[PDB]
Amino acid sequence: ASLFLTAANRWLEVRMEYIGACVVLIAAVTSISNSLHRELSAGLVGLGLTYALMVSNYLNWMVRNLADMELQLGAVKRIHGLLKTEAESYEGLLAPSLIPKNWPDQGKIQIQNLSVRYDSSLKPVLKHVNALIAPGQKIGICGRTGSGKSSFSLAFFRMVDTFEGHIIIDGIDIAKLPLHTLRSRLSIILQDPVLFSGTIRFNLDPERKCSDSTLWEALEIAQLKLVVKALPGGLDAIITEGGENFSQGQRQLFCLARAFVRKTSIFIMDEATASIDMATENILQKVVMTAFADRTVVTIAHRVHTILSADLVIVLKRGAILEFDKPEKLLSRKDSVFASFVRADK
Amino acid sequence: PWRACAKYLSSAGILLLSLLVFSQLLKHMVLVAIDYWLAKWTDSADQTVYAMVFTVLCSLGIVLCLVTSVTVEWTGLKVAKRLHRSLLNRIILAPMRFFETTPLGSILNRFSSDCNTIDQHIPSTLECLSRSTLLCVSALAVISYVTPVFLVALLPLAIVCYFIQKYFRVASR
Amino acid sequence: RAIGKLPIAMRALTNYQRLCEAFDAQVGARAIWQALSHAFGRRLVLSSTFRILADLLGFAGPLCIFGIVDHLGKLGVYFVSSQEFLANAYVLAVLLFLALLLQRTFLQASYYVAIETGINLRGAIQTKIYNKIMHLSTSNLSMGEMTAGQICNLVAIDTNQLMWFFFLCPNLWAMPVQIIVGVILLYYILGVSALIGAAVIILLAPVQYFVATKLSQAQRSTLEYSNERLKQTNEMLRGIKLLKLYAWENIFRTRVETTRRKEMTSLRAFAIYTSISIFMNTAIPIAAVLITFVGHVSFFKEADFSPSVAFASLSLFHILVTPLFLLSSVVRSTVKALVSVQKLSEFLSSAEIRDNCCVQIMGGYFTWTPDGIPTLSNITIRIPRGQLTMIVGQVGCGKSSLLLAALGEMQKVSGAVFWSRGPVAYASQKPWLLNATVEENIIFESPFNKQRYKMVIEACSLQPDIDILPHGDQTQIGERGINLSGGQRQRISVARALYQHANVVFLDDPFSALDIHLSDHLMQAGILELLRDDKRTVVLVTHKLQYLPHADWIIAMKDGTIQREGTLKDFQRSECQLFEHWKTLMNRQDQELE
Ligand SMILES: Nc1ncnc2c1ncn2[C@@H]1O[C@H](COP(=O)(O)OP(=O)(O)OP(=O)(O)O)[C@@H](O)[C@H]1O
Ligand SMILES: Nc1ncnc2c1ncn2[C@@H]1O[C@H](COP(=O)(O)OP(=O)(O)O)[C@@H](O)[C@H]1O
Ligand SMILES: [Mg+2]
Ligand SMILES: [Mg+2]
């Protein structure tokens, strides 16, 4: 394809410079005919012959730079086609001094008839759910895969669109909020490990706001202090691109340690206990249920025994809330979805 | 003419663009005046006025070449600045549904090769394009000056130029 | 199609066969340049000799000006002489036309053979970059030292920069012979008044030395800031989900804006030296006509101010000025070739790869680092034929690295490796996708057989996920195409490693991104069902210890070593503290593990 584009680009220029040499010939013969039987000058014929030589010197640069300006202007057209994309409308409808300074003082998450989709052309992924959580409650959510349980934690943050429902936290609706104030005062942790390069002190503190004492306590409560003390950077150790200096569970624990820096009242979690070992998972569950005792934590469980010590269990299936009670109250009853989840484990 | 040259001129503005077209236009008009004064100088057979007008007109040529080179590099630096810092600030406010639909290597290919084309490869090509076609139309203007018989020869070369250019461009695309 | 196939001399594997024969008789970047000149000297000197033969034929232009307007200023009875023949305007215009036809077609043949040399160079060093890639260890990628975007950036904007240098370098080779024969023709037309203009032609060496060395360090700092900007942009936009959810995008936008600001400082430096290179290369001939026409009618005896020597000298200065305009792009692509060959030889000198039982690693020592303490200490494993094994440990204790030592991707400090190496089927903790169809992802260049294909779809339960896909099975996924769940690509990567017909099937945590039901379907229709019936050896590190009763062997790891190997009764007999730690962990305290 480069050789045929080459041979086309020499074919056009060999025809066009044949036409340019014919321009030299016809300007030469009409200037010597008009200096033969008429009188122009001497020097005007030499000027016309010189610039007739110049247009054969420069016609290939005219046609080749016009083709190169078209081929390089296509990149400006593609950058402008990317540049006309949409936005998110980060500024909300509520006034920016209506909020307090400590906005999430407690957890009063009211789920009032919520239903989300992903896009404008597909189904409601969640049906009409309804909940209200007391502000000390270390609740959990289980369910099947594809049930929307990651999508409900995305629906906390308005990542998906809430086409009906009023999610109200502490007397303040989520949809009337500025989004930087929303997603700065609320801490998700995802299932997938996402880890940038640079270092650990860049990675937990990207904007240079915390001391090393709360960072080393965040490394202590992520069951992680011993390997950062073994690695010879000493908080300035280089994590590489994608986190490929470390293991996959070490990437997950570094992501959980970046969740533990920002002290909000709500630590919504997805399955960050997925793809780590069960011993440090259960030791980490006892560590996060001694540390964040005043904080509401909401987890999505990958394993059904770390949701066994939760306050309430919300089993989601196919868009709707199926069970909503204490875990032993859902265990001691009828052969249900949560009872078959703990039965199919053991 | 596409929309991309319109967005190229709108990102360049008016202030560098007027100097961009007019420094090039007087930069070729000074050279046509230089050898037209040389063609006045060859029919001598009044002395040492021609060499002084030649010296001050090549001084006008070197200062128009100077202001032409810094105005093409000043619009290269200005559109190299301002086609960044708006693409970055209109991809940094994009929703997550946009990233879930579009392939990520297409957006990184836009950020690598097309921005590399905009900062490096475009304004040297713009200098050789403007200088080559303005030397070409000054060559056609001064070959129409010395004879009227080229003006009835100009139409077959232009119609075979337009026919061979359109007949090539349907293969080249 | 009908562009067609290619010629045999323009083939890659014929190109790079000539470069590998030029890689021999070399026993570094100078060695890379010596292999490139020994591989591609002949077509490059054919391009350069076509640019010898054009532009020396290009100097019949001002010779015909010097014929024609010297004529227009003005036995042996029907014969004409050669001086009568070469002072007539019609035959000098016809000779000018034939010389200009032959000069433009030799210029086009020179441009063709230089672009054909650059295309064969691009094919040969593309498969040389790939032949370095297939021996390349992961330890020069995992602990820094390049990124995958940098290795793609090699073939993106360094192979094409060396290709554009091989486009442009016959103009470098046949520039100065045109300069020295053009100034001899300037001496032939008007004599020693043009030797004043020889001083401003010999004054290009500061503006080819100082300007190009300032452009050299400007372009090196430009490419260092641009690789910093592209690496920060690529690590920004893959993590755009966590970057938007944490609201950190203004911080990362500030970081790449400072990287773009330092890159714009180096672009300002490259810009100012490019602009004065364009200014000097177009400002010396218009000074040269000024100094030759003040040297004509002052400081010298006015020998001949004709129109003939005036327009012959101005046409000769315009064909002395029109090859001069390219030289900033010539030194631009020259220094981009020099940093291309320097980074290419830095990439090409990187580190590389070195009893009814398959694998018999006895006493091995393994290190991720080339010069570090070993992450794997003394291991003695035995992986039996046809039987499942499991690797159980904590976080960071050698479990995926034991597999990567057994693949050979780890460097081997000590110990021995014994197999039967055959083909091992393998799916990592991070799943890996192609940008082909989902049926091409599962099959992975095997023969397509729909019964085994239906067995591995309905084994690991992909049929509602194929039913939610818009073209069904023929959707293309990956980086191009349609993005996926995260739980889909784990099953796609482990469903690729059941179709392999390979006896050793390594697994590296397949039950991370799934729930209990699809893991039970993979335990009860995928593994222990398809792989017992072939008696294929499977190795599966997990933390799901509910499936540890379905195990023929247990490897226990902690802190880079193996604590014990054997069976579950062997861990019941003597490793009872770890057995009771598993028993308190599993919460099957009423029952036994068997
Ligand atoms: N790509 C790598 N480069 C350098 N060191 C690594 C790499 N991967 C892992 N390591 C080191 O080797 C040790 C063992 O990690 P390993 O590769 O076994 O992951 P793992 O323990 O299997 O992960 P998980 O516990 O999540 O299954 C880790 O402590 C880590 O520090
Ligand atoms: N980015 C997306 N765009 C459109 N649809 C999605 C997207 N992610 C998931 N879905 C669909 O919506 C459902 C949401 O489930 P999700 O929360 O993603 O996983 P889980 O199975 O853990 O609930 C899935 O069945 C999937 O088909
Ligand atoms: Mg989910
Ligand atoms: Mg691992």
CSV table of N, CA, C and O in Angstrom, one decimal, chain A residues 20-109:
chain,number,residue,atom,x,y,z
A,20,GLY,N,5.2,21.0,-17.1
A,20,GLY,CA,6.0,22.1,-16.8
A,20,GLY,C,7.2,22.4,-17.7
A,20,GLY,O,7.5,23.5,-18.0
A,21,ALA,N,7.8,21.3,-18.2
A,21,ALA,CA,8.8,21.5,-19.3
A,21,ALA,C,8.2,21.9,-20.6
A,21,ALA,O,8.9,22.7,-21.3
A,22,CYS,N,6.9,21.6,-20.9
A,22,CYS,CA,6.2,22.1,-22.0
A,22,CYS,C,5.9,23.6,-21.8
A,22,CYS,O,5.9,24.4,-22.8
A,23,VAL,N,5.7,24.1,-20.6
A,23,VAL,CA,5.5,25.5,-20.3
A,23,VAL,C,6.8,26.3,-20.5
A,23,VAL,O,6.7,27.4,-21.1
A,24,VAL,N,7.9,25.7,-20.2
A,24,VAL,CA,9.3,26.3,-20.5
A,24,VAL,C,9.5,26.4,-22.0
A,24,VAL,O,9.9,27.5,-22.5
A,25,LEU,N,9.0,25.4,-22.8
A,25,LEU,CA,9.2,25.4,-24.2
A,25,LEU,C,8.3,26.4,-24.9
A,25,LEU,O,8.7,27.2,-25.8
A,26,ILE,N,7.0,26.6,-24.4
A,26,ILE,CA,6.1,27.5,-25.1
A,26,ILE,C,6.4,28.9,-24.7
A,26,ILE,O,6.3,29.8,-25.6
A,27,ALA,N,6.9,29.2,-23.5
A,27,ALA,CA,7.3,30.5,-23.1
A,27,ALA,C,8.6,30.9,-23.7
A,27,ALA,O,8.7,32.1,-24.1
A,28,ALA,N,9.5,29.9,-24.0
A,28,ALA,CA,10.7,30.2,-24.7
A,28,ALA,C,10.5,30.5,-26.2
A,28,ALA,O,11.0,31.5,-26.6
A,29,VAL,N,9.6,29.8,-26.8
A,29,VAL,CA,9.4,30.0,-28.3
A,29,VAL,C,8.5,31.3,-28.6
A,29,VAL,O,8.8,32.0,-29.5
A,30,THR,N,7.6,31.6,-27.7
A,30,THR,CA,6.9,32.9,-27.9
A,30,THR,C,7.7,34.1,-27.5
A,30,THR,O,7.5,35.2,-28.1
A,31,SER,N,8.6,34.0,-26.5
A,31,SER,CA,9.5,35.1,-26.2
A,31,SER,C,10.5,35.3,-27.3
A,31,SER,O,10.8,36.5,-27.6
A,32,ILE,N,11.1,34.3,-27.9
A,32,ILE,CA,12.0,34.5,-29.0
A,32,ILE,C,11.3,34.9,-30.3
A,32,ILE,O,12.0,35.5,-31.1
A,33,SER,N,10.0,34.5,-30.4
A,33,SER,CA,9.3,35.0,-31.6
A,33,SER,C,8.9,36.5,-31.4
A,33,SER,O,9.0,37.2,-32.4
A,34,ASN,N,8.6,36.9,-30.2
A,34,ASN,CA,8.3,38.3,-30.0
A,34,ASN,C,9.6,39.1,-29.8
A,34,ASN,O,9.5,40.4,-29.9
A,35,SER,N,10.7,38.5,-29.6
A,35,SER,CA,12.0,39.3,-29.8
A,35,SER,C,12.6,39.2,-31.2
A,35,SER,O,13.6,39.9,-31.5
A,36,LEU,N,12.1,38.3,-32.0
A,36,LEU,CA,12.6,38.1,-33.3
A,36,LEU,C,12.1,39.2,-34.3
A,36,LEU,O,12.9,40.1,-34.7
A,37,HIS,N,10.8,39.2,-34.6
A,37,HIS,CA,10.3,40.2,-35.5
A,37,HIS,C,9.6,41.4,-34.8
A,37,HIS,O,9.1,42.2,-35.5
A,38,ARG,N,9.6,41.4,-33.5
A,38,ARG,CA,9.2,42.6,-32.8
A,38,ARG,C,10.4,43.0,-31.9
A,38,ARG,O,11.5,42.4,-32.0
A,39,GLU,N,10.2,44.0,-31.0
A,39,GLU,CA,11.2,44.4,-30.0
A,39,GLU,C,10.5,44.4,-28.7
A,39,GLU,O,9.7,45.2,-28.4
A,40,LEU,N,10.9,43.5,-27.8
A,40,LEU,CA,10.6,43.6,-26.4
A,40,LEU,C,11.7,44.3,-25.7
A,40,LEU,O,11.6,45.5,-25.3
A,41,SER,N,12.8,43.6,-25.5
A,41,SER,CA,14.1,44.0,-24.9
A,41,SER,C,15.1,42.9,-25.2
A,41,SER,O,14.8,41.9,-26.0
A,42,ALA,N,16.2,43.0,-24.6
A,42,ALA,CA,17.0,41.8,-24.2
A,42,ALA,C,16.5,41.2,-22.9
A,42,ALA,O,16.1,40.1,-22.8
A,43,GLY,N,16.5,42.1,-21.9
A,43,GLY,CA,16.4,41.6,-20.5
A,43,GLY,C,15.0,41.1,-20.0
A,43,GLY,O,14.9,40.4,-19.1
A,44,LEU,N,14.0,41.6,-20.8
A,44,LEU,CA,12.7,41.1,-20.5
A,44,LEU,C,12.5,39.6,-20.9
A,44,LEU,O,11.7,38.9,-20.3
A,45,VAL,N,13.2,39.3,-22.0
A,45,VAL,CA,13.2,37.9,-22.5
A,45,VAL,C,14.0,37.0,-21.5
A,45,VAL,O,13.5,35.9,-21.2
A,46,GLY,N,15.0,37.5,-20.9
A,46,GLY,CA,15.8,36.7,-19.9
A,46,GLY,C,15.1,36.6,-18.6
A,46,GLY,O,15.2,35.6,-17.9
A,47,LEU,N,14.3,37.6,-18.3
A,47,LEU,CA,13.4,37.6,-17.1
A,47,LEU,C,12.3,36.6,-17.3
A,47,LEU,O,11.9,35.8,-16.4
A,48,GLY,N,11.7,36.6,-18.5
A,48,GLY,CA,10.6,35.6,-18.8
A,48,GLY,C,11.1,34.2,-18.9
A,48,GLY,O,10.4,33.3,-18.4
A,49,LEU,N,12.3,34.0,-19.4
A,49,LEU,CA,12.9,32.7,-19.5
A,49,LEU,C,13.3,32.2,-18.1
A,49,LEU,O,13.2,31.0,-17.8
A,50,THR,N,13.8,33.1,-17.2
A,50,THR,CA,14.2,32.8,-15.9
A,50,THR,C,13.0,32.4,-15.0
A,50,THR,O,13.1,31.3,-14.3
A,51,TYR,N,11.9,33.1,-15.1
A,51,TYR,CA,10.8,32.7,-14.3
A,51,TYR,C,9.9,31.6,-15.0
A,51,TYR,O,9.2,30.9,-14.2
A,52,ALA,N,10.1,31.3,-16.3
A,52,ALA,CA,9.7,30.1,-16.9
A,52,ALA,C,10.4,28.9,-16.4
A,52,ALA,O,9.9,27.8,-16.2
A,53,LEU,N,11.8,29.0,-16.1
A,53,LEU,CA,12.5,28.0,-15.5
A,53,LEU,C,12.1,27.8,-14.0
A,53,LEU,O,12.2,26.7,-13.5
A,54,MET,N,11.7,28.9,-13.3
A,54,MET,CA,11.3,28.8,-11.9
A,54,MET,C,10.0,28.1,-11.7
A,54,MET,O,9.9,27.4,-10.7
A,55,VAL,N,9.1,28.3,-12.6
A,55,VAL,CA,7.8,27.6,-12.5
A,55,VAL,C,7.9,26.1,-12.8
A,55,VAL,O,7.2,25.3,-12.1
A,56,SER,N,8.9,25.7,-13.6
A,56,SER,CA,9.2,24.3,-13.7
A,56,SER,C,10.0,23.8,-12.5
A,56,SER,O,10.1,22.6,-12.3
A,57,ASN,N,10.7,24.7,-11.8
A,57,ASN,CA,11.4,24.3,-10.6
A,57,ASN,C,10.4,24.1,-9.4
A,57,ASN,O,10.7,23.4,-8.4
A,58,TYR,N,9.2,24.8,-9.5
A,58,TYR,CA,8.4,24.9,-8.3
A,58,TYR,C,7.0,24.4,-8.4
A,58,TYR,O,6.2,24.4,-7.4
A,59,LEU,N,6.6,23.8,-9.6
A,59,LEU,CA,5.3,23.2,-9.7
A,59,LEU,C,5.1,21.9,-9.0
A,59,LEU,O,4.0,21.6,-8.5
A,60,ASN,N,6.2,21.1,-8.8
A,60,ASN,CA,6.1,19.9,-8.0
A,60,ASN,C,6.0,20.2,-6.5
A,60,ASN,O,5.3,19.5,-5.8
A,61,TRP,N,6.5,21.3,-6.1
A,61,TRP,CA,6.4,21.7,-4.7
A,61,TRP,C,5.0,22.3,-4.4
A,61,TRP,O,4.5,22.1,-3.3
A,62,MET,N,4.4,22.9,-5.4
A,62,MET,CA,3.0,23.4,-5.3
A,62,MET,C,2.1,22.2,-5.2
A,62,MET,O,1.2,22.1,-4.3
A,63,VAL,N,2.2,21.2,-6.1
A,63,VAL,CA,1.2,20.1,-6.1
A,63,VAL,C,1.5,19.1,-4.9
A,63,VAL,O,0.6,18.6,-4.3
A,64,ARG,N,2.8,18.9,-4.5
A,64,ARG,CA,3.1,18.0,-3.4
A,64,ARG,C,2.8,18.6,-2.1
A,64,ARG,O,2.4,17.9,-1.2
A,65,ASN,N,3.0,19.9,-1.9
A,65,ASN,CA,2.6,20.5,-0.6
A,65,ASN,C,1.1,20.8,-0.5
A,65,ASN,O,0.6,20.9,0.6
A,66,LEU,N,0.4,20.8,-1.7
A,66,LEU,CA,-1.0,20.9,-1.6
A,66,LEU,C,-1.6,19.5,-1.2
A,66,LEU,O,-2.5,19.4,-0.4
A,67,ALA,N,-1.0,18.4,-1.6
A,67,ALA,CA,-1.4,17.1,-1.2
A,67,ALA,C,-1.0,16.8,0.2
A,67,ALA,O,-1.7,16.1,1.0
A,68,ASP,N,0.2,17.3,0.7
A,68,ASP,CA,0.6,17.2,2.0
A,68,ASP,C,-0.2,18.0,3.0
A,68,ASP,O,-0.4,17.6,4.2
A,69,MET,N,-0.7,19.2,2.5
A,69,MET,CA,-1.6,20.0,3.4
A,69,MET,C,-3.0,19.4,3.5
A,69,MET,O,-3.5,19.5,4.6
A,70,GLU,N,-3.4,18.7,2.5
A,70,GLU,CA,-4.7,17.9,2.6
A,70,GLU,C,-4.5,16.7,3.5
A,70,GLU,O,-5.4,16.5,4.4
A,71,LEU,N,-3.5,16.0,3.4
A,71,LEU,CA,-3.2,14.8,4.2
A,71,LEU,C,-2.9,15.1,5.7
A,71,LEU,O,-3.3,14.4,6.6
A,72,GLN,N,-2.2,16.3,5.9
A,72,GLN,CA,-2.0,16.7,7.3
A,72,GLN,C,-3.1,17.5,7.9
A,72,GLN,O,-3.2,17.7,9.1
A,73,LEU,N,-4.0,18.0,7.0
A,73,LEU,CA,-5.2,18.7,7.5
A,73,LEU,C,-6.3,17.8,7.9
A,73,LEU,O,-7.2,18.2,8.7
A,74,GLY,N,-6.2,16.5,7.4
A,74,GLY,CA,-7.1,15.5,7.9
A,74,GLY,C,-7.0,15.1,9.4
A,74,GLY,O,-7.9,14.7,10.1
A,75,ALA,N,-5.7,15.3,10.0
A,75,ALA,CA,-5.5,15.2,11.4
A,75,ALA,C,-6.2,16.3,12.2
A,75,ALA,O,-6.6,16.1,13.3
A,76,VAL,N,-6.2,17.5,11.6
A,76,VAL,CA,-6.9,18.6,12.3
A,76,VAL,C,-8.4,18.4,12.2
A,76,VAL,O,-9.1,18.7,13.2
A,77,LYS,N,-8.9,17.8,11.2
A,77,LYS,CA,-10.3,17.4,11.0
A,77,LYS,C,-10.7,16.3,12.0
A,77,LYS,O,-11.8,16.4,12.6
A,78,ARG,N,-9.8,15.4,12.3
A,78,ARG,CA,-10.0,14.4,13.3
A,78,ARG,C,-10.0,14.9,14.7
A,78,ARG,O,-10.7,14.4,15.6
A,79,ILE,N,-9.1,15.8,15.0
A,79,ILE,CA,-9.0,16.4,16.3
A,79,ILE,C,-10.2,17.3,16.6
A,79,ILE,O,-10.7,17.3,17.7
A,80,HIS,N,-10.7,18.0,15.5
A,80,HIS,CA,-11.9,18.8,15.6
A,80,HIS,C,-13.2,17.9,15.7
A,80,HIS,O,-14.1,18.3,16.4
A,81,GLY,N,-13.1,16.7,15.1
A,81,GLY,CA,-14.2,15.8,15.3
A,81,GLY,C,-14.2,15.1,16.7
A,81,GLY,O,-15.3,14.8,17.2
A,82,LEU,N,-13.1,15.0,17.3
A,82,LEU,CA,-13.0,14.6,18.7
A,82,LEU,C,-13.4,15.7,19.6
A,82,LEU,O,-14.1,15.5,20.7
A,83,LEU,N,-13.1,17.0,19.2
A,83,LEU,CA,-13.3,18.1,20.0
A,83,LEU,C,-14.7,18.6,20.2
A,83,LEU,O,-15.0,19.2,21.2
A,84,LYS,N,-15.6,18.2,19.4
A,84,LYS,CA,-17.0,18.5,19.5
A,84,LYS,C,-17.8,17.5,20.3
A,84,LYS,O,-19.0,17.3,20.0
A,85,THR,N,-17.2,16.8,21.3
A,85,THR,CA,-17.9,15.8,22.1
A,85,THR,C,-18.6,16.5,23.2
A,85,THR,O,-18.5,17.8,23.4
A,86,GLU,N,-19.3,15.8,24.0
A,86,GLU,CA,-20.2,16.3,25.0
A,86,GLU,C,-19.5,16.5,26.3
A,86,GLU,O,-18.3,16.5,26.4
A,87,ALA,N,-20.3,16.8,27.4
A,87,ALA,CA,-19.7,17.0,28.7
A,87,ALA,C,-20.5,16.3,29.7
A,87,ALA,O,-21.4,15.4,29.4
A,88,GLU,N,-20.3,16.6,31.0
A,88,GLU,CA,-21.0,16.0,32.1
A,88,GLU,C,-21.9,16.9,32.9
A,88,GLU,O,-22.7,16.5,33.7
A,89,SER,N,-21.7,18.3,32.8
A,89,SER,CA,-22.3,19.4,33.5
A,89,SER,C,-22.0,19.2,35.0
A,89,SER,O,-22.9,18.8,35.8
A,90,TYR,N,-20.7,19.5,35.3
A,90,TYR,CA,-20.2,19.2,36.7
A,90,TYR,C,-20.8,20.1,37.8
A,90,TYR,O,-20.9,19.7,38.9
A,91,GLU,N,-21.2,21.3,37.4
A,91,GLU,CA,-21.9,22.2,38.3
A,91,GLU,C,-23.3,21.8,38.5
A,91,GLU,O,-24.0,21.6,37.5
A,92,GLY,N,-23.8,21.6,39.7
A,92,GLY,CA,-25.1,21.2,40.0
A,92,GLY,C,-26.2,22.3,40.1
A,92,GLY,O,-25.9,23.4,39.7
A,93,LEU,N,-27.3,21.9,40.5
A,93,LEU,CA,-28.4,22.9,40.6
A,93,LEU,C,-28.5,23.5,42.0
A,93,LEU,O,-29.1,24.6,42.1
A,94,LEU,N,-28.0,22.9,43.0
A,94,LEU,CA,-28.1,23.4,44.4
A,94,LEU,C,-26.9,24.5,44.5
A,94,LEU,O,-25.9,24.4,43.8
A,95,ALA,N,-27.2,25.5,45.3
A,95,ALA,CA,-26.3,26.6,45.5
A,95,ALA,C,-25.0,26.2,46.3
A,95,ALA,O,-25.1,25.4,47.2
A,96,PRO,N,-23.9,26.7,45.9
A,96,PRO,CA,-22.6,26.2,46.6
A,96,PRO,C,-22.3,26.7,48.0
A,96,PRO,O,-21.3,26.2,48.6
A,97,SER,N,-23.2,27.5,48.6
A,97,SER,CA,-23.1,27.8,50.0
A,97,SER,C,-24.3,27.3,50.8
A,97,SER,O,-24.4,27.5,52.0
A,98,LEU,N,-25.1,26.5,50.1
A,98,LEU,CA,-26.2,25.7,50.8
A,98,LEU,C,-25.6,24.5,51.5
A,98,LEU,O,-26.2,24.1,52.5
A,99,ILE,N,-24.5,24.0,51.0
A,99,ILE,CA,-23.9,22.8,51.6
A,99,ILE,C,-23.1,23.3,52.9
A,99,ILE,O,-22.7,24.5,52.9
A,100,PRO,N,-22.9,22.4,53.9
A,100,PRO,CA,-22.0,22.8,55.0
A,100,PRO,C,-20.6,22.5,54.6
A,100,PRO,O,-20.3,22.0,53.5
A,101,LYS,N,-19.7,22.8,55.5
A,101,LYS,CA,-18.2,22.5,55.3
A,101,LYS,C,-18.0,21.0,55.6
A,101,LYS,O,-17.4,20.3,54.7
A,102,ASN,N,-18.5,20.5,56.7
A,102,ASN,CA,-18.6,19.0,56.8
A,102,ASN,C,-20.0,18.6,56.3
A,102,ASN,O,-21.0,18.6,57.0
A,103,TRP,N,-20.1,18.4,55.0
A,103,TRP,CA,-21.3,17.9,54.4
A,103,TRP,C,-21.7,16.4,54.8
A,103,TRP,O,-22.8,16.2,55.3
A,104,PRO,N,-20.8,15.4,54.6
A,104,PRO,CA,-21.3,14.1,55.1
A,104,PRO,C,-20.8,13.9,56.6
A,104,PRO,O,-19.8,13.3,56.9
A,105,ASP,N,-21.6,14.5,57.4
A,105,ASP,CA,-21.4,14.3,58.9
A,105,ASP,C,-21.8,13.0,59.4
A,105,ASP,O,-21.2,12.4,60.3
A,106,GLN,N,-22.8,12.4,58.7
A,106,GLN,CA,-23.3,11.0,59.0
A,106,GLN,C,-23.8,10.4,57.8
A,106,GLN,O,-23.7,10.9,56.7
A,107,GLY,N,-24.3,9.2,57.9
A,107,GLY,CA,-24.9,8.5,56.8
A,107,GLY,C,-26.4,8.4,56.8
A,107,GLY,O,-27.0,7.6,57.6
A,108,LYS,N,-27.1,9.2,56.0
A,108,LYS,CA,-28.5,9.2,56.0
A,108,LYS,C,-28.9,9.0,54.5
A,108,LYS,O,-29.7,9.8,54.0
A,109,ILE,N,-28.4,8.0,53.9
A,109,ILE,CA,-28.7,7.6,52.5
A,109,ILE,C,-30.1,7.1,52.4
A,109,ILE,O,-30.4,6.0,53.0
